[PDB]
Subunit: 366 residues, 3 copies
């Protein structure tokens, strides 16, 4: 007799709006000020159209396969166009319709992160094909594997808000793209800004409820982002003699990414230590072919966050505590496996997607 | 013994903020990148000052006449400055003060849509006069007629979030203006963006509560907007050989508008079919004197949405179901009447307003 | 047996996001379009890094000293890194973690207002030192004095959302800075916009709950801002023959500031009268060395708001009513004292901070 709680309903609809704010115009504007000015309009168009396409595919089969009961790798196809979901169906403590909208907005932003990164160098029709393939055969199974009670979840993987599902997944997809293939810094910062605010929806929302864990995630997000900014900036001041706007904006992102899988499981001590290590590591990454340094931050910091969750979730270290019977040893192993599975899964799919495009319309923008 | 529900309180205050975000800076920035660059500052000023004036008129007599008990066409004047509204007065399941703020923000955005459209070509003092007339004698009675238990509502008109009260109403007011009387596309998209996010406040908020219907409206908004984008874009690719940023931004708006009256009454199937037809129809409109194509999208798509609600609310078609004793036949008729009443009411008033200005200070900007 | 209410949890986390939106990118962008274009990137960087530093200092000792039990002037140091705060600890009707995040975001925005004002003319390392000093020895004690059950609160001072803690405090700190020491108007308005929307989080959020008082504050915010815009604009039309965008944006701020201490205690009548007097007074201020007219609006309107709360909170005048045994006479006196204590406290500290910087790294940007 599952009963929807209006307080949770309220929180999760607003959180869905926030995550939606991340893509439209968040990620669009972030990339907008980074890419060559002659490429901006084509990019914003591509993000917008691919946003739309993702919203639709999610409704048709996206949600059903991501989040329906199935196997360890995917759901099913009987929630097609959300059929058999009663309007009053409750998932967790919120109406299911709001879970669809929430989970959909994650799908959008992830796609937004790859589209914007590669909009400069890929044909319009070729990114569409890619999106369709990689949403379907990478993001959806991994979503299901991590948040849909599939393989990774069934083996105790900690990923509170999408270090694998979003960050690693997309960073590897981006890297594959570049392998096969700033002009407005106020615009970049504005994007970073919208991304940051939008990100409280993503991290607190992942609690599914306005509780003490939503509260922990929110606090940890503020903390680790700030730690990452200062860590990056300090590093930049040491390496380059001075902080920069792009470094500060990059810092914030590095720690937002690092804290993503962790925010709901760690103490503020942990959030701070993670923000610092994520900020430095992100700086290290972009100091070491990667489009708009998407792996250099998302990939590198995605890995750092996911590994460091396997440590800082420990009650000893201020976390919520590992599950019963789980050692920090074993949990670390499982994160490594989650990470490695994501990297390979996305990579292989990315390769299939781009190649499908490359053999139907061509990658190379005319 | 009506009791205010804090969850609803929370939702409706945040939703009010979102709708407020639509005008300030949403609609301002949308028009900002469309109009000639030499006109932008005068426009943003005019939207801001007229926003303020609308916030005030709403408090003085706006809310009382829109939403007080009266006749079929207007309320009364005993909630002047919100007197006789106890601070703890409850409307629906939220405190009345939050209903005032919500309904006020609709009033603002509607006005924002006309002001911004005509800011280029109308004298400052002449728009003020217009606003005062047309808020008072068009938006307020129609508000009351549709959402204040007046004429249109009493006859079963479906308009969940303002296809008539907002979109048709303002589009006709805009058309009258032009009859008598892009430079920054990143800015236009940013505006579209803020408008989109802000619009979840308008559509879900219209539920008055964080329930399964707020959930339906939110989902339908995401769906139909996305459908509209792809529909517009595809049409544009057929007509023009390629999608454009303005087309994509226009697409989103077309479907946001189309779904506005429908979002709380239809299934996602319906949202998708409405988004598509609204996107194509919007494109058709702007292909066929209309200031910033305000009728071409708001008018045309306003009509499409309102008519199509009379169809897709049917349980057969996945909707919430028509009221008892109501056939799809009869419901369609009533939408047509709602539409026709709005078009004529706003038109006649618009004509009175502009002429009053034109005979006191003059329309024609010096 | 204090029990956290999920509805309040939801409201206060979203309100925290809104206040966070005020700084990042709100205040950054406001100043962005005001300062010389050659200074903008250095400014946005400085706001971002000092934001981060404030988020961290708040977590380490900021919250503990601001909001722990202590004396009349400061709390304590046993909530260092939020230790001894159980994750499920409840303050008011929300989890304590959300109070930390809320109160932290006030700390950020206040700092944002001084940093942005003086970013043009102060050395990076010198502002850092300043921030550390003045957050610690001004903002924290005043926070504690006004909202932490300290001196000013214990004597019945009304300041619902920070006329002293935020506005006067920062305006005086800014004035001290200038004493010792527009290019993008669309950007300025966008900032004003984000500031306005963000401000509903600050004013309603200060209720701690989604109740009738959150509802009153929200309504009053809309009202007084609008009143202030028209008051400023009308004054500007009289003084200068015409309204300007900067005047309108300045108007909105003047009334937002004026209503800040008052919003939770006054009637809408009062909100309107306060908005008007705040708008005119703000205009008067900037007509009478003050960096980006920060005192001319925040200082002047901060004082006006705080004094005028001591009047309009009266039930006679439509307010919530003064406390038992409190006359309007006595309440006015106490506001004057709150005001005077803030002005001197911040001033003295500001002087210490800047001088510490000036004698370690130097003020004067190289
Ligand atoms: C918990 C949800 C996670 C949301 C993911 C969105 C990533 C936004 C960051 C974009 C920055 C892109 N860049 C250049 C650093 O790679
Ligand atoms: C449910 C609330 C409806 C809100 C109405 C606001 C309309 C925003 C769209 C502006 C687009 C203007 N334009 C040029 C397409 O006409
Ligand atoms: C209730 C919270 C108060 C938030 C304080 C933030 C102040 C924002 C206004 C910035 C305007 C700066 N200026 C130039 C007018 O001084």
């Amino acid at each position: 007799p599952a009963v929807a709680d209006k307080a949770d309903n309220a929180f999760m609809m607003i959180c869905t709006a926030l995550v939606l704010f991340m893509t439209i115009p968040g990620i669009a504007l972030f990339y907008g000020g980074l890419i060559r000015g002659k490429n901006v309009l084509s990019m914003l168009t591509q993000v917008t159209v691919t946003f739309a396409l993702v919203c639709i595919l999610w409704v048709v089969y996206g949600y059903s396969l991501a989040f329906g009961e199935g196997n360890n790798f995917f759901g099913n196809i009987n929630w097609l166009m959300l059929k058999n979901i009663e309007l009053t169906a409750v998932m967790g403590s919120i109406y299911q319709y709001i879970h669809v909208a929430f989970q959909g907005s994650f799908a959008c932003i992830t796609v937004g992160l790859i589209v914007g990164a590669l909009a400069e160098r890929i044909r319009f029709s070729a990114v569409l094909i890619f999106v369709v393939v990689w949403l379907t055969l990478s993001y959806i199974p991994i979503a299901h594997m991590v948040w849909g009670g599939g393989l990774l979840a069934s083996h105790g993987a900690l990923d509170f808000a999408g270090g694998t599902v979003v960050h690693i997944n997309a960073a590897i997809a981006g890297l594959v793209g570049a392998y096969l293939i700033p002009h407005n810094l106020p615009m970049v910062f504005t994007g970073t800004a919208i991304l940051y605010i939008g990100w409280f929806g993503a991290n607190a929302g992942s609690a599914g409820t306005a509780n003490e864990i939503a509260a922990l995630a929110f606090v940890n997000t503020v903390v680790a982002t700030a730690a990452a900014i200062l860590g990056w900036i300090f590093g930049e001041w040491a390496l380059r003699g001075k902080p920069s706007l792009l470094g500060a904006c990059s810092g914030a992102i590095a720690g937002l990414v690092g804290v993503t899988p962790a925010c709901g499981y760690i103490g503020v001590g942990g959030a701070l230590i993670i923000g610092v290590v994520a900020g430095l590591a992100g700086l290290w990454g972009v100091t070491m072919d990667d489009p708009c340094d998407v792996f250099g931050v998302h990939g590198v910091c995605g890995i750092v966050g996911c590994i460091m969750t396997g440590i800082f979730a420990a009650s000893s270290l201020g976390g919520v505590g590992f599950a019963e019977g789980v050692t920090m040893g074993h949990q670390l192993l499982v994160q490594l496996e989650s990470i490695a599975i994501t990297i390979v899964w996305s990579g292989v799919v990315a390769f299939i997607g781009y190649k499908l495009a490359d053999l139907t319309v061509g990658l190379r923008v005319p």
